[PDB]
Chain length 301, copies 5
């Protein structure tokens, strides 16, 4: 079966149609070739034979001075935007400006929604983890944070790609003049409007990137604080265990003294009880004295 | 209800007025459009139809060759600066230079105050934490440090945005000539003065950024030193606990020897006390000898 | 023995030949010198006397307006690509475009295969390690991850070299015109096609580099999470050991009390059993009371 | 009281004078304004009305085609350099070259002295800390290292500022021609000499920055090595404590066996001593056998 | 004593001479001044009065259209290269190309030898350390690794300096034309050959820098893996010690029960042996039951 594109076409007035067209017929209808409608890059903006070709992560659009086309829209939840919002936006400037503005606004809104969803989850997770009232932390939250950080890195990469793609065009005036496809097809400055649009969208992308960077540095700082808190708790626990070990060692020393003195033989002291009381008191007090001296030795350190 | 701007207007002589004006009426009065007075960016400097538009984090100003306007000043604690200082500053160069200088000076002073407030708190907290006389540290101070670091990152982002916005204009002479709105409206070099102003403010922002970077690297170094101190304390505590365990093990070994020799049976040695004294001395001395040998074994490591 | 190149030659029609030729004879046949056919760089693209010289990590190609040559193809598993695919690709544009496209596509496919092989192994290893259900992790997996990370770094370096080499040419139009060797040899725009090819391959390389960077940051985050999990497990284990030590210390204290009271002498209390029961109950209950108080003391911390 | 500058003036022949002059009188004497002699930047180099203005961290100089002036030299330990060295340096090229060379050489020598003082202290401290023969390290040395690192960061910032300030001028020829104040005041190439001077000083600053970067990376590596050594010592100590605990557990198990067999009741075995000897030997040997088996179990791990 | 240079002179034919010449006489013989032959930079390439001046870390060369001079060659192990190899290299292009190629090749070979010596030592040390079969690692190897890393950082700095110095010249055509000293002294393109030489050497330096960067990242990854392995071993050791402590606590609890029941008083149970056997079995079994329950409690965590 020959390959076919699932195309949806928008007119200047906002009329909407949808069908499936073979690639060869689509090439013949336009002045393009299969070399162009390949979509080998994640993000791309290009001009060929007075036809604009734009592609995003999952969006593919072709702009013509009299119509717009979107390709491969199936199973992408684009129906609400396609059949409810885009016609309203497209309904004195040429069609190209409106189409470009609509597509860029859609992409920017998608990125903004992604960031707004990501931010509160990470903030809440970090606030919960940083709680210094617990000597341990959960791990499902750690896994969630790892996944959200991976998503944040992907979002940052996408934003950087968007910024680079826009900047590559904003630098050269040749591409800016090329985008004025209507002027060339059928010969107030278009260049100023295009520059304003691109600058606005680039600034928005820059703001999003700055926010993402702030979030990442916050994550790193939270990780460091968590490490410090865990280390402090470890040190406190070891101090307590050490002190108890000191007391136990002294107590066991005196207990050995007592039991060894309690040999199951003849010592010639079995006829005196005052001696037994004296040795009992001796062990009981000496344990405390040695314990206090050893605590002082620990303290001097 | 139609949207309205809460506007305050300053004249050349310093006269001050304040009112509320609908957006459509404001557009009609000027030569601008709703496309411009949108304020979609955190920071922006632009020129349209010989009218300057400037925006900061929460400040919105429009400069006209004969007047200045500030929008959305309510609930922002700007009354003292608006009605007490700005008229004095505005009271031979055109109005645009004075207005731009006043606004830039206000922003720079705000950033300087933020940095001056942030610095001593972080310095004191780090000095308190680095104290090597304690095996543990507080956690409320850690939370305060985390919050202050987040604020520092935000301040650095704002400073970078300011620097980039100023540099984007300082590079091109077209925008510099555009800023001379009075010359174009009603046709000594203005460009030199504008360049001097922008360079001065850019240098101040660079100094602030350098200070913030120094603070951040200091924070990182303090964190590393804290980690090292905690590790050293842990090692010392483990050494002490180990030594006490060695002594306890030897002592318990000899105590087992004694108790096992003290079986509740007939051994045929119950008629000798010298033997009991000999075994008591044997355990008492051998404990010390084994303890010393084991300490030597630990030391050789 | 004079040095010789193992050369394989492809014609415009796709005809294939292979032989061995001495370096001096090869230089004489062409208009080049030994200074050029040295291959001292890992990656290189150059033009000399209307002859293109290209080199990769292990590939060496010379492009002539009427033929293509590949050098040192032995023991490199290139037979399948050389004798099965390249002739089909070479079978209206000149030969140079086809040859360059084929070689660049080969290199890009090799890099893509490398990355696709590397990704799943690292992902699976990290998923296995991050499992928070174990207090310890394997080490053979760690060694495998280290080796794969080294390979990833090498791949990133190669991708960066490719991007830099392509960009160095894309910037200057002189080299672009030079690549049109057929036009100069025997005097629609070639420059546009060359620019399109180079831009496409550069964008593909950029995508690969972005993917590698994402993988590296994921590795770092996984390492940090592993550290945190290990620290938490350590803290929990120390808490348990501490509590058991507290109980043991109290129990041993009361046991010492009992044994010391059980001296092998005359105390004048051997005629009372109620006293023995009372002391037994006293130790048994006091152990629990002291243990509970000490647990409360631990909890307050 | 009107503000006054403490000025010291150097003539072409090297004559030296010093006095205090009001700012208004100083402005009137020159062709400058208060806008210029403000000194709002840490480092600055500028030209105004054929007068050079230079400022460093604490140095302020004004160069005139016939004289040099230094401002605010009090309480700065500049007397030795001012009244002993500068006249000798100033005693065929114009005065501006000599003055600029002297000031730049002074600043470079100051930075070199700072770096030479900082280096040996850090090197010695790191060498002392890295000593792997100790399980713990001092903390006063850590504080000293932290302070020295802060100073190093400040020095790096100053060097970077110097480099940027020089480069900003070296790029544009307009400023280079402006620095030839004598030529403009009273109309062999001056530009070549200025370029040589600036390039030399920039290269020296670059060398200093490289040295500082090397020192910083050395510090980081030393920190990592310290962490590794502490971790290894911790592991060794825990191994020893574990082994001793294993032995103690076995010994206490057999001691419990013995004491429990030594109940203070009637067992019907009190008439046999061979049994007592057998049980004593049994415990004594079984302790060792269990200890060896448990050590083997530890080793297999 | 007046300063003197230890000079060695090479002629076009390869003739070699060596002597000592005073600086003033050397300046008079050439068209240079003491300002040039100062050698204040670690690396430098410059042209003055149709004379080339080049300096490396410890090499100082002056190129003249008819001769070459090397200064301060004593105590530097340069005899083998000076009197055995350089004449062969110098024996249709002018002398300058040969001299520059020889010097650059010497420097590149030195750097390559340094890197080739450094690599295997670091690789072997890291392979030995990463061995996960040991719970501890040596420290002399750590010191060796630290020293080798310092040397690697120095080598990277030198390579970067070389690259920057070459690039500074490759950018501007004025310096390229200046290097053609023979053409200017006594008026096929020299510029092409110079560009080829500089590009080749720059690419070689870039390859060396990439290799060094790969080595550094490998070192960092190895450090992280070492940390992880040590942490895992610590956790395993703590688990074992914890389990043994649990068993010991239960055993000591039951031993206390037994000894306390064995009071040296009258209990009225001394006439029953079945009771003694029952209590012995009770303690012996209950120890195991409690131990198993506590192990289950540990496992559930
Ligand atoms: Ca992606
Ligand atoms: Ca640690
Ligand atoms: Ca903000
Ligand atoms: Ca490689
Ligand atoms: Ca007894
Ligand atoms: Ca400073
Ligand atoms: Ca060096």
């Amino acid at each position: 079966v020959a390959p076919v594109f699932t195309v949806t076409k928008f007119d200047k007035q906002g009329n909407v149609t949808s069908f499936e067209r073979k690639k060869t017929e689509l090439y013949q209808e336009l002045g393009l070739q299969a070399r162009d409608l390949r979509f080998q890059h994640v993000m791309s903006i290009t001009v060929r034979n007075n036809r604009i070709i734009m592609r995003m992560e999952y969006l593919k659009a072709v702009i013509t001075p009299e119509c717009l086309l979107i390709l491969d829209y199936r199973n992408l939840n684009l129906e609400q935007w396609l059949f409810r919002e885009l016609p309203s936006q497209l309904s004195p400037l040429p069609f190209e400006f409106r189409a470009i503005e609509a597509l860029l606004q859609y992409w920017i809104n998608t990125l903004q929604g992604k960031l707004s969803i990501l931010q509160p989850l990470i903030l809440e997770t970090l606030d919960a983890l940083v709680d210094p009232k617990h000597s341990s932390v959960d791990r499902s939250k750690l896994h969630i944070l790892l996944q959200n950080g991976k998503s944040l890195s992907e979002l940052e990469t996408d934003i950087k790609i968007f910024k680079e793609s826009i900047l590559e065009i904003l630098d050269e005036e040749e591409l800016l003049e090329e985008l004025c496809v209507s002027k060339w097809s059928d010969p107030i400055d278009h260049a100023e409007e295009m520059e304003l649009l691109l600058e606005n969208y680039y600034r928005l992308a820059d703001d999003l990137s700055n926010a993402a960077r702030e979030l990442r540095v916050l994550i790193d700082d939270s990780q460091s604080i968590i490490f410090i808190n865990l280390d402090s708790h470890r040190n406190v626990m070891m101090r307590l265990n050490l002190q108890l070990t000191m007391g136990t060692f002294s107590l066991s020393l005196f207990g050995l003294m007592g039991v060894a003195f309690g040999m199951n033989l003849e010592s010639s002291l079995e006829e005196d009880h005052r001696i037994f009381w004296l040795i009992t008191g001796i062990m009981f007090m000496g344990s405390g004295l040695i314990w206090r001296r050893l605590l002082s030795f620990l303290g001097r350190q």
